[PDB]
Design a protein around this ligand. Structure first.
Ligand code: A1A7B
Length: 167
């Protein structure tokens, strides 16, 4: 039993909800919140901009130190940093950005990072401003993640489309 509330069960381990991941993180304080990161951990917009703003820019400060020490992430890669006031940990995961020409086949590699964590609150990777089809992203998530994932979908219209079209 966990503290997540109001989710639709899609499969044994994948759940989905129409919600703002920031407010969901602030309420649940999950062990792991996933950020829709880029390789430079520059959290300007989309999910990343929203998570960072909610931390009063502490996420960005921590991230800049991480990059100064380690260099950029790989597309498809991840790193574990603090969750600040939102979660115990933030798993920054780099889905491919279609608006940069990155290979959508890397989306599966991105979701594989979730399997290192027993339970996660997450957005759909590569959706939104990363330019991929959210229906496809959900399919890859379901077919790749084996741990317990709670997906927050900000757009109410999009959520209903994902559910109604889910196979
Ligand atoms: O609903 C989806 C599906 C793909 C993804 C993206 C859409 C555009 C770029 S990325 N998204 N957005 C969000 N996901 C989680 N929490 C969110 N809180 C919000 C508060 C205001 C506005 C949007 C969101 C939002």
């Amino acid at each position: 039993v966990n503290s997540f509330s109001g989710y639709l069960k899609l499969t044994d381990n994948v759940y989905i909800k129409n919600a703002d991941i920031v407010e969901e993180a602030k309420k649940v304080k999950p062990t792991v919140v996933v950020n829709a990161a880029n390789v430079y951990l520059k959290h300007g917009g989309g999910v990343a901009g929203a998570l960072n703003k909610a931390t009063n820019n502490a996420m960005q400060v921590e991230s800049d130190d991480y990059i100064a020490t380690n260099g950029p992430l790989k597309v498809g890669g991840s790193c574990v940093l603090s969750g600040h006031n939102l979660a115990k940990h933030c798993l920054h995961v780099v889905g491919p950005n279609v608006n940069k020409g990155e290979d959508i086949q890397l989306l599966k590699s991105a979701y594989e990072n979730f399997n290192q964590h027993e339970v996660l609150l997450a957005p759909l990777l590569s959706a939104g401003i990363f330019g991929a089809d959210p229906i496809h992203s959900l399919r890859v998530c379901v077919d790749t993640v084996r741990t317990n994932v709670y997906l927050a979908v900000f757009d109410k219209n999009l959520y209903d489309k994902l559910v109604s079209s889910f196979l």
